[PDB]
């Protein structure tokens, strides 16, 4: 009543990641009933931090009664991105596709990868564990969802303030490099580069061999898409090691010489303007529908054989097609030619007409 | 009599928001009779502050005998904007449209949204509450009116002094961003951008992901309408989340290819001059009457189906049509194409001939 001063502080900040927790599943943060979403959530936030190099933000957790008593929503920067439904006390199990037999569990879905799911009681673990199922506790069904959301939205999770912390962690290793890098690219320019690297989900663990490449290639162009190409050409090793396995033989698609040429025409035309697009899209010659059609099949065709999906392109089209594979197909990999080692021999599968 | 020095201080300042309180309803601020307009008014000024991000001004309250003993006027920056009439002691109830039955209450109107209203005694609440009505105390009839006035005039409520407080509240989060933003856009330039964002009523809660976008896009253009487009493309998520619901399917209008083209002609023509208008209006080819005619129907046609009103345009016409929907229709939403996610599939309703 005597809040007679309202101050800007009364306005609550917004947070990058936040969890909404409905009634039936608030027995997960209460610090007594073996709160998983203070360790399991840190489990993901660590076993993914140390993997992608930069400390992922702190997942905050709130419980808005506004929603159904047994659901949760994950919010990126202000508001929901994905919203799942948790069974009251029936643990979920997944059948990868090699498991056989079913259990009495109520059908559901996998909120992570859109797989069929059965929600089984706490006792039937044996029947799941002895039939070959992939059972998971309640909290993990969330934590895996948060992991997928982080791994997808990696870009927006990298703030204009980590670019300070990255240079700190890099001065710890090569203290003379940053002192020569920060004077070559102002942090506004650096961040765009890390954004372009994290969009296509490239790990920034070995920051030295990344600042080295930015410092090198900074002379020619300060464009943050020509720079993100060079860093990827320098990380070709870990790129392919993460996309495909250590098997030297490699299977991938390739652009159809016709369609591939048809695009380069568009880029050259748009080159009339001052590269109005960086490379994300210069021209939409109505083949965008053809793409939005094939790229799902392109993922699925290679998912008729089990091998991970990859796609080869010209380097000049590399940065473009990354945007499509980032929106249309939830899973893909667009690699250039020079981004693949001369060690791993590749095997084209076919064109795309 | 010995006020022999008259000093500039004797001149009373003017205030952004101020309330006028006639006789019959001064029993609302007197601090004894459960003064609602020191808590309810703060109720709105808080549950709207924390929503739109920036601390709304302090509503001042005065009682000029000049007016009828039972009316009130709300004043923005010097003088009345809206003026309501309060029944002596008969509480008002509203029938949303789904409620059935009437009560003895004297007819009136809803000062908020122009709805039919009945003013009932304090006892008939049950008959209202058991018939399905929306009854409200005297003070709330005001407080809701103040809320509507704030939510409409948000722009003029954002002073050239908050741009200091916004950077303070943003240094609290990303202290290295402002120190790199304030050196990129002088506060005179920043404010115009926040003005353009608040005109179409976009929340500024997540200031980090807004300064980030202004800092980014500041290289190309310092025009505060090309900047307000990029911030909205970056907030597309919360934009649509606030206009429509979380339902992925979406229904909206679209410009008639003919009329849409007819405007772009006008913009290109005006491009002869140095973009004499930012984008609010380059050319009035007498289709302004057609607009002032349709936009009311455009609101109402979609109010024949209950779904919230939206309108799609070209991005190059986006900033223009925002001015019309800000004046002609008290409620509308003009969204571009790139301002809508690729997640929510849209459903056009029809052109506008």
Author numbering:
A (entry chain A), B (entry chain B): 343 to 695
Question: Paper's wording?
Answer:
Type III secretion systems (T3SS) are bacterial macromolecular machines that facilitate transport of protein substrates across the bacterial cell envelope. Most building blocks of the virulence associated T3SS or injectisome have a homologue in flagella and one of the most highly conserved parts of the system is a set of transmembrane proteins known collectively as the export apparatus (EA). The FlhA/SctV cytoplasmic domain is known to form a nonameric ring underneath FliPQR-FlhB/SctRSTU, but the full-length FlhA/SctV complex remains poorly characterised. Open and closed states have been described, with the open state being competent for chaperone-substrate complex binding, while the closed state has been proposed to be responsible for binding early substrates.
Out of the identified proteins we chose FlhA from the lateral flagella of Vibrio parahaemolyticus (Vp-FlhA) and SctV from Yersinia enterocolitica (Ye-SctV) for further studies, as both could be produced in large quantities at high purity using the gentle detergent LMNG. In contrast, Vp-FlhA was found to form the predicted nonameric complex and we imposed C9 symmetry for particle refinement, resulting in a 3.8 Å volume of the cytoplasmic domain but little detail in the transmembrane domain. A striking feature of both structures is the N-terminal density of the cytoplasmic domain, formed by FlhAL/SctVL, which reaches out to bind to the adjacent protomer, demonstrating this well studied interaction for the first time in the context of the full-length protein in both flagellar and injectisome T3SS. In both of our structures a hydrophobic residue, Trp350 in Vp-FlhA and Phe367 in Ye-SctV, sticks into a hydrophobic groove on the neighbouring subunit. This residue in FlhA has previously been shown to be involved in ring formation of the cytoplasmic domain of FlhA. Comparison of our structures with FlhA from S. Typhimurium, St-FlhA, in the open state and Sf-SctV, which is in the closed state shows that both of our complexes are in the open state, with Ye-SctV being the first example of an SctV homologue in the open state. We simulated the movement of FlhAL by overlaying one subunit of Vp-FlhA onto the SD3 or SD2 subdomain of the closed Sf-SctV structure. This demonstrates that adoption of the closed state in one subunit would affect the neighbouring subunit, potentially propagating the conformational change in a wave around the ring. Our structures are not affected by crystallisation artefacts and are in the context of the full-length protein, suggesting that the open state is the default state in the absence of other factors. Our structures also suggest that at least in the open state the residues known as FlhAL/SctVL, which have previously been described as the linker between cytoplasmic and membrane domains, do not form part of this linker but are part of the cytoplasmic domain.
